[PDB]
Amino acid sequence: TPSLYAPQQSADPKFSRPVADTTRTMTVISEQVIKDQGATNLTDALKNVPGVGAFFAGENGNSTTGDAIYMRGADTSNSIYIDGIRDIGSVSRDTFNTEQVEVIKGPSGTDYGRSAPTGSINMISKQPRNDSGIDASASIGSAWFRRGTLDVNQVIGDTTAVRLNVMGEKTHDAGRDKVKNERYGVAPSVAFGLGTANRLYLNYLHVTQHNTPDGGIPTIGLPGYSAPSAGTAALNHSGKVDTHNFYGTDSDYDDSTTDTATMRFEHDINDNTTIRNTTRWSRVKQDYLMTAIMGGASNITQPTSDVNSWTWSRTANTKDVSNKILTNQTNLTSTFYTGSIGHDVSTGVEFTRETQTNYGVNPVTLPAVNIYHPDSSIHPGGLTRNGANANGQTDTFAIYAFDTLQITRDFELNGGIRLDNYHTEYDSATACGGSGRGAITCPTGVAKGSPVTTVDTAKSGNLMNWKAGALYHLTENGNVYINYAVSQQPPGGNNFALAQSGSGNSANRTDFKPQKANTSEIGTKWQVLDKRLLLTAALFRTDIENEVEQNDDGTYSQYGKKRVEGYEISVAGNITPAWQVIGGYTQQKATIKNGKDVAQDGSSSLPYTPEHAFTLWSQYQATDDISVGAGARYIGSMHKGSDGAVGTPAFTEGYWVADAKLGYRVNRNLDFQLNVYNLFDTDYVASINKSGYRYHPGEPRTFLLTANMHF
Ligand SMILES: CCCCCCCCO[C@@H]1O[C@H](CO)[C@@H](O)[C@H](O)[C@H]1O
Numbered sequence: 001t002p003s004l005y006a007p008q009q010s011a012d013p014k015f016s017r018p019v020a021d022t023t024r025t026m027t028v029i030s031e032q033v034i035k036d037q038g039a040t041n042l043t044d045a046l047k048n049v050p051g052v053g054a055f056f057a058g059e060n061g062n063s064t065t066g067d068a069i070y071m072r073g074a075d076t077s078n079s080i081y082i083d084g085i086r087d088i089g090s091v092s093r094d095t096f097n098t099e100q101v102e103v104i105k106g107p108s109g110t111d112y113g114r115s116a117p118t119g120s121i122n123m124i125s126k127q128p129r130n131d132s133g134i135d136a137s138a139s140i141g142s143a144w145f146r147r148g149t150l151d152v153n154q155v156i157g158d159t160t161a162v163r164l165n166v167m168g169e170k171t172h173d174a175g176r177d178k179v180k181n182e183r184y185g186v187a188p189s190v191a192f193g194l195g196t197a198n199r200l201y202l203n204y205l206h207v208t209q210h211n212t213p214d215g216g217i218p219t220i221g222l223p224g225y226s227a228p229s230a231g232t233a234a235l236n237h238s239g240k241v242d243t244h245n246f247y248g249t250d251s252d253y254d255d256s257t258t259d260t261a262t263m264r265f266e267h268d269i270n271d272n273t274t275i276r277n278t279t280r281w282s283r284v285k286q287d288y289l290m291t292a293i294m295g296g297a298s299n300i301t302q303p304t305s306d307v308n309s310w311t312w313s314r315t316a317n318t319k320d321v322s323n324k325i326l327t328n329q330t331n332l333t334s335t336f337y338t339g340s341i342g343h344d345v346s347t348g349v350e351f352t353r354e355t356q357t358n359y360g361v362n363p364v365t366l367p368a369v370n371i372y373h374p375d376s377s378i379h380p381g382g383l384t385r386n387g388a389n390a391n392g393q394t395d396t397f398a399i400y401a402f403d404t405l406q407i408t409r410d411f412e413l414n415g416g417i418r419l420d421n422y423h424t425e426y427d428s429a430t431a432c433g434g435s436g437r438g439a440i441t442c443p444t445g446v447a448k449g450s451p452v453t454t455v456d457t458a459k460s461g462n463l464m465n466w467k468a469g470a471l472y473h474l475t476e477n478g479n480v481y482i483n484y485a486v487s488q489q490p491p492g493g494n495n496f497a498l499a500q501s502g503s504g505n506s507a508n509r510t511d512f513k514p515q516k517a518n519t520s521e522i523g524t525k526w527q528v529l530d531k532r533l534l535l536t537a538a539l540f541r542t543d544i545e546n547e548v549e550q551n552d553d554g555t556y557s558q559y560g561k562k563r564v565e566g567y568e569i570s571v572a573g574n575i576t577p578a579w580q581v582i583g584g585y586t587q588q589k590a591t592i593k594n595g596k597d598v599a600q601d602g603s604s605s606l607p608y609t610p611e612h613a614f615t616l617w618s619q620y621q622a623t624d625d626i627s628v629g630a631g632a633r634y635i636g637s638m639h640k641g642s643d644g645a646v647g648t649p650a651f652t653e654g655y656w657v658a659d660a661k662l663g664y665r666v667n668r669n670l671d672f673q674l675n676v677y678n679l680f681d682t683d684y685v686a687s688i689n690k691s692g693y694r695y696h697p698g699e700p701r702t703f704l705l706t707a708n709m710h711f
Contacts, residue, residue, distance in 0.1 A: 048617065051613030507548050627665075
């Protein structure tokens with residue numbers, strides 16, 4: 001029987017073997033784990049994979065929001081898929097309608113097309129079930145947290161059933177003042193022909209969010225903080241700022257809507273061969289007003305020489321954006337023999353249009369903020385569109401073919417080839433007559449504030465990616481594998497932006513090549529204790545090439561090289577019928593092989609990347625009524641990216657977070673849960689910005705009481 005903590009297979013038909021027989025660093029976080037841990041979003045559920053989280057706060061004109069996930073030494077936020085379909089938006093993704101999350105470390109261009117040199121994160125959506133029931137969850141937690149979720153599956157006919165997922169979350173912040181997060185969701189689904197060779201799945205998903213965004217707090221007092229100048233010397237002795245202090249404005253807001261319609265037709269030609277066709281329309285809106293703080297010598301105002309009077313400048317970080325994705329994906333999976341060789345083929349054709357428009361807004365001039373006693377009770381107002389927007393489009397036609405050749409009962413070979421034919425179009429304009437950062441002068445006969453185009457280009461290209469693996473069953477319980485993969489990210493692949501050919505340092509330069517990630521891997525997977533526990537161990541090397549670097553003369557070129565090398569181990573499943581365990585450890589060394597240093601301390605290291613990361617979670621069924629759980633996360637020391645800012649910590653120190661759980665069940669319809677997070681009320685640096693002026697403090701000890709009603 002399969003363990004609830006270790007799902008046996010990926011829901012993606014692109015994966016022709018179970019997790020154990022898959023030649024990849026794959027982790028499947030189930031709905032069961034999320035529910036026991038009290039995880040309600042992607043980031044929290046991703047804590048189940050070591051060295052995966054939002055480790056970077058942003059720059060000075062921009063700050064990171066939502067699931068700004070860093071995995072394997074780089075921002076992987078653009079490589080977040082829902083049902084094997086790209087989902088782009090600096091918004092938090094809720095787990096109210098996801099059955100499982102699939103994480104793969106080590107990219108492959110064959111898997112989902114263009115990607116970050118990290119791997120893939122895939123949120124698998126809830127579909128209508130054969131059985132009927134209702135599931136409810138009411139939650140009350142620390143800092144006025146409230147959560148209500150409903151999961152209704154109802155069978156209508158012999159071959160038709162409906163599914164409805166409802167959600168409501170209204171909360172405050174336990175360790176941050178004025179920060180409020182409100183969201184709700186509806187997810188209706190209808191499936192026809194269940195149990196037959198013909199099936200139609202129709203799904204809709206709507207999420208509205210109204211949040212108060214946080215831009216962090218001053219890094220004063222942290223290890224490695226120095227005063228920026230002799231004039232501001234006092235800052236070396238004044239100490240750390242109160243972690244609760246909110247430096248934003250009472251006008252700060254973060255509003256986002258998510259609308260995704262999906263239509264899947266599945267036809268079983270035979271008990272071996274099946275054809276699928278998925279159509280999806282999706283739109284992610286997001287508009288926010290945020291506050292970034294600056295504390296260089298030129299940003300510090302000294303009214304009375306007493307540090308309690310001293311102020312830091314405020315900089316508005318705005319966003320008015322829409323991400324639209326229209327796609328059609330055809331997939332065919334067949335199992336057949338070619339003599340003594342068994343085949344497991346997965347092939348398909350995908351057509352996609354991705355749109356990103358950043359509606360320009362008027363500059364928001366914010367006043368200075370007191371360092372130790374900030375006043376956020378100010379109203380500079382919301383946003384006003386100025387007509388000067390950025391438009392990005394990407395038309396993508398991909399054709400793939402994957403095969404797992406079962407050579408013997410003990411030997412397996414597997415391959416894959418994909419061709420992505422793309423066309424990206426980019427334009428961006430700025431309102432003229434401005435004063436500050438990148439202000440364009442108004443030409444003749446052009447009235448003030450008029451949009452003046454700065455970029456208006458396009459890029460077309462082909463992307464040939466491939467993969468290869470071999471697996472050998474040592475015992476009936478354990479195997480040994482090898483894998484190699486090619487992944488590419490073309491100019492305009494990262495965020496639709498492009499640059500005019502022959503000039504800058506941009507990877508998005510239309511004359512530039514894509515960034516290639518070559519991944520070598522040797523591993524071992526083992527299914528023990530009646531196949532109820534999965535133990536894994538891999539050695540990896542991800543080489544990144546065609547990175548942009550400056551030549552001896554001012555001019556730039558793609559001679560740069562990076563390497564993310566390491567060791568991976570993982571545990572998932574049941575130890576005994578009452579003992580459940582999920583987790584792993586990673587030793588990942590991410591360095592610059594060729595090129596300029598990116599780390600602040602001039603080391604060859606890559607920033608916002610822990611070298612060592614550990615995550616363990618266990619649950620024991622103490623008695624028939626009492627279940628007890630515990631968790632432990634270690635995130636290592638990380639380098640801050642290089643920057644002109646003086647006296648800002650060049651790095652953040654490592655931290656250990658511990659969690660606990662205890663569940664009591666009354667009858668078989670009602671059960672209670674109590675989750676305590678950050679059990680030792682440990683303080684730490686969750687993330688730091690590029691300049692190094694601001695950091696996000698570690699979430700303090702927080703409680704969560706849940707009522708679980710099942711039918
Ligand atoms: C798994 C063992 C259960 C321990 C229950 C919580 C005990 C930790 O308690 C915390 O310890 C910190 C020092 O470590 C103190 O700074 C905090 O004030 C205190 O709340």
